[PDB]
Structure 1
Amino acid sequence: LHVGPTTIKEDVLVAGLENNVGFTSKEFVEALAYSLKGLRYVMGASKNYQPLIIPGGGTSAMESVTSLLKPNDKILVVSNGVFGDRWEQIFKRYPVNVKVLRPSPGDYVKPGEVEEEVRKSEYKLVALTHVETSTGVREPVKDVINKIRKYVELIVVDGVSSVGAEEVKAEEWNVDVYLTASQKALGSAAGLGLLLLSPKALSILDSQNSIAGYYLDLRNWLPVMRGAEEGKAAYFATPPVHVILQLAEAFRLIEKEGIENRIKRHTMVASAIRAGLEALGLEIVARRPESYSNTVTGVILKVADPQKVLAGTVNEGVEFAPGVHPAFKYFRIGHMGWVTPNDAIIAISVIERTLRKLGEPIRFGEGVKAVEEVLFS
């Protein structure tokens, strides 16, 4: 159970075995069109919102937002950790003005604090992170946007670790760019960044110049996306053909389960794992319980070394992820994509026996029952 689930459904991987398929083939065009619709479905938007699928991943999707910007534009980044900070690292490469709001480690920036800033100063674009993967902290995006919508021209949300697992309502919340990647809660193969654009965002692409480069200017990919939905092949640059076939199959499986059911499963599994961690007497990295993400949980270690924990759990049946925040000593549990109640049982079981052998103060024999209790309901 890692950041970037390493286990992909077999149906999804097998979908990439289709041969004699290139970017002009009707099989590809159909898979692209289907994925584009699937993006609207998981982000909750009507045909008024424009999906785009581009090469790379969450980072190339984030940088592609420069397609909506002009020199000297003012940007406010609301950063809860590493991947909030990535917006700033990206925008440092561009002729734009950036201000960043940050909270105390492992906490989150309150809607009122964002409201105060956007009311004081004029901002073209506000960047949010739905789930900050470094800390497992979920920002209350609906509440933030409710406060700020009328003060700012554009709102972008990095949903790389939220889309397909947390409630996302891109149209209803009036988001201008909601973006994700193929390999996280969508549970498909890596190599694609995914974006959903509002009418207002689309009008910028269609009517204005921008500070974008070439490969990541969303204007260059738009004819390919519009084309696909009209059943037409187009060429800008060669896309990851087989990765997109795999993506269409992931979306077929997501629609089959149903997005509401998928969200509920993530909520149940995450609450169950958290229950187990608490019953073990382990502390969660996320400071505020209302922001406990349903995809990532950081697990503070008071005595044991997190590397030893990572090495010891793999030889016991589960792979987790390391902690990457100077303020905490921790490891992370990724619980996203196709994660099941049974995975929750195994994760806590493995955590218990690994921490036992490494001398972390825990309450033995309590983890799994706590998990079972939640799943029992």
Structure 2
Amino acid sequence: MEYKVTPPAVLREPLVTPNKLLMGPGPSNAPQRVLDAMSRPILGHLHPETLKIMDDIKEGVRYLFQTNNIATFCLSASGHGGMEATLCNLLEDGDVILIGHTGHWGDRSADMATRYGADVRVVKSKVGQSLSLDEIRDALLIHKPSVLFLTQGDSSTGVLQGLEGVGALCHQHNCLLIVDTVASLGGAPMFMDRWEIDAMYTGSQKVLGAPPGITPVSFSHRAVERYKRRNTKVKVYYWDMSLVGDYWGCFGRPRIYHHTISSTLLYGLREAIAMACEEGLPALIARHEDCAKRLYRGLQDAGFELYADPKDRLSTVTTIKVPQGVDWLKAAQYAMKTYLVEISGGLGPTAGQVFRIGLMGQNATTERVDRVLQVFQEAVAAVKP
């Protein structure tokens, strides 16, 4: 009995996980409480204690999103999974969707929507700006879409998209509104119900500081109605809102087996959400906004130029122009090798054009703002001609 592949020598070595200050746009440093929780024993996916944790997570997501939507749950996937599921459930072949493009996330959503068979339309913001209400209105009228997709915090450009009045306008025109809040939730105001948003998701690893890989999502009654009027089943069983909603106790029905939830990620997310709810939205968002203001003053005093329009900045991800002659990758490497602090480059349209400093969760403190200002300045100075 012969085995051509042998046990890997590499696995005989210890697992190495250096403890870094993650000042990029995510993931952010996990609270010790969330790391401790993830050593708890595994539970069965349909055990009452598991369902209890899921139930408590639902209440916490409803708080953070400011929604009473019964269709509120989490997806067993990273943040892209929120984008996937929201598009997969709410689009059928040939449906017209309008993507409000304020950065990379417009490109990614357009990609997924085309993969799902939709007729994709795009309205693009001015450079470093959000879309105005007029620009959104004009595009809605022209395209007559059934779905509008916006990214509240575009982490590629560091742009915060305003949302007041947008859902109301969508609803005047038989259109659903889907909003990505992965980078923005906790760092900017969000009122899902008040702003008439129909589908929304966030990430676990950004402001929350939970492990990556589980993503809160919510659907309005209008979005559930759209699902009910589908003529064919959604393309992916794994994302089907009715079936995961049932697993999460959302609708009339018995809890049945859909898939095995990761109790580990449930534990970390539950603790992260508990911490956020205890701080409370007003304090949480003020903290991120206030840290961002401190970061701007420090950057601008040092002669750096910010990428986003001043009226349009997202507190949690700050895009800063790469100065004349500096090799951004070399600057990042200097910071990592000398201090174990992460400073990031750009994404999508800003690739190679910017640095991105994230101020999220455990890292949105005056101490950590001052630390990243210090090391960023040193790293840039180290590599500059």
Question: What is the alpha-carbon distance in structure 2 between the residues aligned to residue 226 and residue 79 of structure 1?
Answer: 34
1:348 paired with 2:373, answer: yes
Instruction: Give the equivalent residue in structure 2 for 1:334.
Output: 358
Deviation at 1:351, TM superposition (A): 1.7
Instruction: Give the equivalent residue in structure 2 for 1:371.
Output: none
1:2 paired with 2:27, answer: no
Instruction: Give the equivalent residue in structure 2 for 1:62.
Output: 83
Question: What is the alpha-carbon distance in structure 2 between the residues aligned to residue 142 and residue 291 of structure 1?
Answer: 14
Question: What is the alpha-carbon distance in structure 1 between the residues aligned to residue 96 and residue 52 of structure 2?
Answer: 39
Question: What is the alpha-carbon distance in structure 1 between the residues aligned to residue 369 and residue 237 of structure 2?
Answer: 44
Q: Amino acid of the residue matched to residue 197 of structure 2? A: V
Q: In 1, are the aligned partners of 2:70 and 2:251 still within 8 Å (CA)?
A: no
Deviation at 1:93, TM superposition (A): 1.0
1:226 paired with 2:249, answer: yes
- Using structure 2 for the length normalisation, give the TM-score: 0.87
1:178 paired with 2:197, answer: no
Q: Amino acid of the residue matched to residue 298 of structure 1? A: T
Instruction: Give the equivalent residue in structure 2 for 1:193.
Output: 215
Question: What is the alpha-carbon distance in structure 1 between the residues aligned to residue 250 and residue 163 of structure 2?
Answer: 32
Task: Classify the secondary structure of the residue corresponding to 1:23.
Answer: coil
Mean CA deviation greater in 136-145 or 76-85:
136-145
Q: In 2, are the aligned partners of 1:5 and 1:334 still within 8 Å (CA)?
A: no
Task: Classify the secondary structure of the residue corresponding to 1:108.
Answer: coil
Deviation at 1:325, TM superposition (A): 4.3
Question: What is the alpha-carbon distance in structure 2 between the residues aligned to residue 228 and residue 68 of structure 1?
Answer: 18
Q: Amino acid of the residue matched to residue 307 of structure 1? A: L
Instruction: Give the equivalent residue in structure 2 for 1:372.
Output: none
Task: Classify the secondary structure of the residue corresponding to 1:298.
Answer: strand
Q: In 1, are the aligned partners of 2:28 and 2:361 still within 8 Å (CA)?
A: no
Instruction: Give the equivalent residue in structure 2 for 1:214.
Output: 237
Question: What is the alpha-carbon distance in structure 2 between the residues aligned to residue 20 and residue 43 of structure 1?
Answer: 28
Q: Amino acid of the residue matched to residue 248 of structure 1? A: R
Q: In 2, are the aligned partners of 1:30 and 1:228 still within 8 Å (CA)?
A: no
The count of aligned residue pairs is 357
1:36 paired with 2:61, answer: no
Give RMSD over aligned pairs: 2.1
* Closer/same/farther in 2, CA of residues 209 and 193 from structure 1, 3 Å limit: farther
Question: What is the alpha-carbon distance in structure 2 between the residues aligned to residue 188 and residue 209 of structure 1?
Answer: 37
Q: Amino acid of the residue matched to residue 75 of structure 2? A: I
Question: What is the alpha-carbon distance in structure 2 between the residues aligned to residue 290 and residue 164 of structure 1?
Answer: 19
Deviation at 1:146, TM superposition (A): 5.0
Q: In 2, are the aligned partners of 1:112 and 1:147 still within 8 Å (CA)?
A: no
Deviation at 1:101, TM superposition (A): 1.0
Unaligned 5+ segments in structure 2 are: 1-22
Q: Amino acid of the residue matched to residue 73 of structure 2? A: L
Deviation at 1:27, TM superposition (A): 2.4
Q: Find the partner of 1:13 among 35, 57, 65.
A: 35
Deviation at 1:238, TM superposition (A): 1.2
* Closer/same/farther in 2, CA of residues 181 and 20 from structure 1, 3 Å limit: closer
1:319 paired with 2:347, answer: no
Q: Percent identity?
A: 25
Task: Classify the secondary structure of the residue corresponding to 2:339.
Answer: coil
Instruction: Give the equivalent residue in structure 2 for 1:295.
Output: 316
| 1:36-185 mapped onto 2 (5 Å cutoff) | 36-46=58-68, 48-65=69-86, 66-145=88-167, 147-185=169-207
Q: In 2, are the aligned partners of 1:61 and 1:194 still within 8 Å (CA)?
A: yes
Q: Amino acid of the residue matched to residue 51 of structure 1? A: T
* Closer/same/farther in 2, CA of residues 109 and 152 from structure 1, 3 Å limit: farther
1:248 paired with 2:273, answer: no
Question: What is the alpha-carbon distance in structure 2 between the residues aligned to residue 69 and residue 323 of structure 1?
Answer: 30
- Using structure 1 for the length normalisation, give the TM-score: 0.89
Mean CA deviation greater in 250-259 or 320-329:
320-329
Task: Classify the secondary structure of the residue corresponding to 1:195.
Answer: strand
Q: Amino acid of the residue matched to residue 94 of structure 1? A: Y
Question: What is the alpha-carbon distance in structure 1 between the residues aligned to residue 79 and residue 178 of structure 2?
Answer: 13
Deviation at 1:89, TM superposition (A): 0.7
Q: In 1, are the aligned partners of 2:180 and 2:202 still within 8 Å (CA)?
A: yes
Question: What is the alpha-carbon distance in structure 2 between the residues aligned to residue 207 and residue 148 of structure 1?
Answer: 18
Question: What is the alpha-carbon distance in structure 2 between the residues aligned to residue 222 and residue 131 of structure 1?
Answer: 26
Deviation at 1:233, TM superposition (A): 5.1
